[PDB]
């Protein structure tokens, strides 16, 4: 992700 | 033929090599063209008064065994970036999947929030299928990506600055 990085493996 | 673009990567002081990537303009022409134009810098200045250009920008979040993320050329931290289309653009399609190491895919903040941020996978990341647009893959210099990946950390902070010292189209 782009602003709030969250749990697990995301972008 | 599908365009090919490159990054010359710097890790700390060290010239790490050239990563060359093919862009699937035959499947994701709009997504491919954004990335391509950002490598060249040809669209000039964007809406944040920053060159629409990856040159100089860093891979700010690298997670070994998962991916390398960059493309935030307006804030360098994951909060910025913009497309050649004006801020964010629509998810083009989800035809392609996260099938293995080397795949290029779009980072986002939910549906239809594509800007300039992208990731290079270092593994098959199939849990992202249908949520991130797959638009290309590394075809040469994957060893440079391996080298980037060694400088990253589990939570994603890099112990060396990984920067795109130059870039463009071939
Ligand atoms: Mg441009």
Numbering used by the authors:
A (entry chain A): 1 to 11
B (entry chain X): 2 to 171
Article excerpt on this structure:
Cyclophilins (CYPs) are ubiquitous proteins involved in a number of fundamental cellular functions in a large number of organisms, such as animals, plants, fungi, bacteria and viruses. Many proteins of both groups possess a peptidyl-prolyl cis/trans isomerase (PPIase) activity, implemented by the conserved FKBP- or CYP-like domain (CLD). By these isomerases the transition from cis to trans in an X-proline peptide bond, a rate-limiting step in protein folding, is stabilised or accelerated.
In the present study we have compared three similar B. napus phloem CYPs plus a homologous A. thaliana CYP by enzyme activity assays and by structural analysis to understand if the minor differences in amino acid sequences alter structural or functional features. A crystal structure at 2 Å resolution enabled the analysis of the inhibitor binding cleft and suggested together with substrate docking no significant changes at the catalytic binding site, except for the non-conserved amino acid position 110. The calculated respective RMS values for main chain atoms are around 1 Å, and the overall fold is highly similar compared to HsCYPA as well. However, Mg2+ did not show any influence on the enzyme activity. Furthermore, the crystal structure revealed a malonate molecule forming non-bonded hydrophobic contacts with Ile46 and Gly47. This binding site might interact with an unknown small organic metabolite in vivo. Most of the residues involved in substrate recognition and CsA binding are conserved with similar orientations. Due to the alanine in position 49, the hydrogen bond of the Ser49 side chain reported for CsCYP cannot be formed. This leads to only two hydrogen bonds connecting the divergent loop to Glu83. The activity assays under oxidative treatment showed that this is still sufficient to provide the redox regulation mechanism via this interaction.
